[PDB]
Amino acid sequence: ENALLRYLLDKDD
Amino acid sequence: PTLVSLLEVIEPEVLYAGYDSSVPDSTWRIMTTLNMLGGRQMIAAVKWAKAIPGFRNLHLDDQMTLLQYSWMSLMAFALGWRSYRQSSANLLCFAPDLIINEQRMTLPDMYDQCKHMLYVSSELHRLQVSYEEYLCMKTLLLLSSVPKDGLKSQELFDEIRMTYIKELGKAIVKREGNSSQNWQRFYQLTKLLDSMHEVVENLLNYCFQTFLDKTMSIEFPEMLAEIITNQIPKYSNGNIKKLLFHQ
Ligand SMILES: Cc1cc(C)c(S(=O)(=O)N[C@@H](C)CNc2cccc3c2cnn3-c2ccc(F)cc2)c(C)c1
């Protein structure tokens, strides 16, 4: 569904 | 470290639009550039939110929800502040290489799109809003809407939100006062916060129209396409509770 936002929140910064 | 100083240090860096001012202006060109710029501001907004004390403690679904509801509120508020700091006119300072000047506002449909954001900028100026008050208000804008049935971590959310309402209180007091003048200021700043819902509703009407009408050839980057796609059904099904300070 909201793949990109989910990735950005889940990934390490 | 104070809570407001933790909000200060995570302030996103200024992004450039990549706007070639040698080539002439057009509304479509400015709109297209602002949409591409907007996606980059929103990728940076995710990084920013993750560093807000308390935010990462909410359920991942609530993190997603809050960013998707508040995206335009955050952007118009950040832009209003950036515009109030650089002007002294006032103009819309989207990027150092893309300011919506006097001439640009005479382009077809530009003014109608700009006026609501100009109201935000003119209000921060009129109220002489400080750096610390703005930082507290901006985080509060991220926490300005919840779903109809609330969040997964609603109890924690309400605690985090109270903490930032108190944080706004502390910034208002730093300029005392005093002290019915403090009540007057808290009333004014939270009244501007409440007015952001109306500002955003008007911004989303243009945004949703240009996104849905493919014959306009108005491009949105993936980050925004995904936010818009998620938000359009939520609005049509009344799945939004806009939190208000005043009724
Ligand atoms: C003038 C105008 C207004 C709107 C509201 C639209 S739209 O169709 O919705 N599309 C939106 C996504 C156009 N992009 C933006 C809207 C609001 C603030 C924005 C951007 C892009 N960058 N910033 C921004 C700049 C500085 C800052 F400090 C914070 C954020 C467009 C295309 C043009």
Nearest to B224 by CA among B213, B241, B239, B208: B208
Q: Tokens at residue B206, please?
A: 């243009």
Say how far apart CA B188 and CA B157 lie, in whole Å: 24
Angle (CA) B126-B131-B136 rounded to 5° is 100
Say how far apart CA B238 and CA B234 lie, in whole Å: 6
Number of other residues whose CB lies within 10 A of the CB of residue B177: 13
Pocket test for ligand 1, best of B16, B71, B75, B119 (most atoms within 8 A of CB): B75
Q: Residue with structure tokens 């009244």?
A: B191
Residue B54 region by backbone torsions, left for phi larger than 0, else alpha for psi between -120 and 50, else beta: left
Strand partners, B145: B242
Contacts of the segment A2-7: beta carbons below 8 A, 24+ positions apart:
A2/B64, A2/B68, A2/B226, A2/B227, A2/B230, A3/B226, A4/B222, A4/B223, A4/B226, A5/B46, A5/B64, A5/B67, A5/B68, A5/B223, A5/B226, A5/B227, A6/B60, A6/B64
Q: Tokens at residue B141, please?
A: 């804008």
Q: Tokens at residue B45, please?
A: 């907004």
Pocket test for ligand 1, best of B15, B34, B82 (most atoms within 8 A of CB): B34
Say how far apart CA B183 and CA B123 lie, in whole Å: 18
Say how far apart CA B212 and CA B220 lie, in whole Å: 11
What are the DSSP calls for B146-186, one per residue?
Answer: E-TT--TTHHHHHHHHHHHHHHHHHHHHTT---SHHHHHHH
| B27-50 vs B222-236: helix crossing angle, rounded to 10 | 80
Q: Note whether B26 and B107 are within 8 A (CB).
A: yes
- Domains detected in chain B: 1-247 (1.10.565.10)
Task: Calculate the alpha carbon distances from B171 to B7, B16, B167, B236 in Å.
Answer: 12, 30, 7, 37
Query: Which ranges in A1-13 belong to alpha helices (H)?
Result: 3-10
Q: Note whether B144 and B105 are within 8 A (CB).
A: no
Residue A12's Cα: distance from chain center in Å?
A: 10
Shortest CA gap B46–chain A (Å): 7
B70: Cβ contacts below 8 Å, ≥ 6 apart: B141, B142, B143, B144, B145
Strand partners, B92: B100
Is B227 in contact with A13 (Cβ distance < 8 A)? no
Say how far apart CA B159 and CA B154 lie, in whole Å: 9
- Check residue B136 and report its DSSP letter: H
Q: Tokens at residue B157, please?
A: 């959310």
Instruction: Mark the breaks in chain B: residue after which each occurs, C to N over 2.5 Å.
Output: none
Q: What does R_g of chain B's alpha carbons equal in angstroms?
A: 18
Listed by number, the residues of chain B in 101-160 with a beta carbon closer than 8 Å to a beta carbon of chain A are none
Strand, helix or coil at A7?
A: helix
Angle (CA) B9-B79-B177 rounded to 5° is 70
- Check residue B239 and report its DSSP letter: -
